[PDB]
Design a binder for this molecule. Structure first.
Ligand SMILES: C[C@]12CC[C@@H]3c4ccc(O)cc4CC[C@H]3[C@@H]1CC[C@@H]2Nc1ccccc1
Ligand SMILES: C[C@]12CC[C@@H]3c4ccc(O)cc4CC[C@H]3[C@@H]1CC[C@@H]2Nc1ccccc1
Lengths: 228, 242
């Protein structure tokens, strides 16, 4: 049944690198509603995330509404770890799309996002200091999808394999056994901060949802209403 | 053990750290309650119990090695951010041998259907039980539990402190103490006969659960805020989460 545990660690990494979504650009010309492009891009990236999740090993090995459950719980976490990953080499800026940067002051047009924005910046600055590698990133993102909504046994055996994968990357990188388990802990503790930002962004969008401007996507509303 | 430059946490061995975190444990509190529940009755007990555990949590954090090396403001900030995470990890630990029920206090043990007495607590109650069931399937030990609770205290609010060189030293201190607790967790797993692959998987499984504890803390923080209108100390912690 479960052919996701027979993967090579090299295969495990190679699958996640090519399953990555395409690159998305903001189709705007700067001059308005800064709350229009983020929600539009978040709307656009949710479609490929649904396509991306199908290519995550072990994801299609379970029930359709279990797949929806994991996606609806982690959809904002996945967008955030991806955003934090892209903004690493851009200190003080959050590359939503290569056409959009928005540093804190420029990003602060919107009320209530002053703190979430600087939580994403510090998370990006945290990945920068650790020099997070892309192969490590795709492993953490898959962990986010599988772990955010489990509370089953099959999901854990894939997660246990991603841990061995992450460890396999660090040992290949020359890190000692102590440096390996220390770096494993540092990365997974960041996921707790990503979850914290995910719950804050859900409440921020909700209060702004029950307002006239500016229209949210049906998919964005659908994924948000899954959190009640 | 003086400065962040030569903190006690980094001069202790693995088992001396376990001995420090096990002895730092706060006393087990009992509920000032006479056992028939009402909606305001069970609300009054849990918020009275949470406030009395908050007072002893403040003194507990000062006995976690390396915590008193931070500034007094940064000490309060870590407590303000993780106070509910700390209350909930203790509850799910106390409830491992009480399946389907949550042991808030040795005289205050609640089941799933009792948790409907407080409207909107149902969703939080099942998550707490599913996590206590989670720790039950892993047979989490007390030595590992006190490590995870100290990881929560130090890590939850670490990235929410001035852009100064002194602020960075506060950040680097927490990370070095956290690396110290990581080696302690690994040392406990190596003692129990677990292989290095097992030593990395279980450490990963434990820390991923902390992400669920953070989730339940944000759900319990919002519901508690919608349920207000609670001691001033409990409100002080809640207003710190906006
Ligand atoms: C919901 C949100 C706007 C959308 C943001 C976004 C968009 C695209 C993406 O790739 C990542 C993210 C992460 C943060 C999302 C914001 C959270 C608060 C905003 N309202
Ligand atoms: C916030 C909370 C009541 C406090 C609970 C608690 C108390 C002591 C303790 O050692 C652990 C815990 C963990 C769970 C905490 C509950 C989460 C849901 C509750 N909310 C609430 C809001 C208004 C009135 C009563 C309870």
């Amino acid at each position: 049944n479960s052919l996701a545990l027979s993967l090579t660690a090299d295969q495990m990494v190679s699958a996640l690198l090519d399953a990555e979504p395409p690159i998305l650009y903001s189709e705007y010309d700067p001059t308005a509603s800064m709350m229009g492009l983020l929600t539009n891009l978040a709307d656009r990236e949710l479609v490929h995330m649904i396509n991306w999740a199908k290519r995550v090993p072990g994801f299609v090995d379970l029930t359709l509404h279990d797949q929806v459950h994991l996606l609806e719980c982690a959809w904002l976490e996945i967008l955030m770890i991806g955003l934090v990953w892209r903004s690493m080499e851009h200190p003080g800026k959050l590359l939503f799309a290569p056409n959009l940067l928005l540093d804190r002051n420029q990003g602060k047009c919107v009320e209530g996002m002053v703190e979430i924005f600087d939580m994403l910046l510090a998370t990006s600055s945290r990945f920068r200091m650790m020099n997070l590698q892309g192969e490590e990133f795709v492993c953490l993102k898959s962990i986010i999808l599988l772990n955010s909504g489990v509370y089953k046994d099959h999901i854990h055996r894939v997660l246990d394999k991603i841990t061995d994968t992450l460890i396999h990357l660090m040992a290949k990188a020359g890190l000692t056994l102590q440096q390996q388990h220390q770096r494993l802990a540092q990365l997974l503790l960041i996921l707790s901060h990503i979850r914290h930002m995910s719950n804050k962004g859900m409440e921020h969008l909700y209060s702004m949802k029950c307002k006239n401007v500016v229209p949210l996507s049906d998919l964005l509303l659908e994924m948000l209403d899954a959190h009640r």
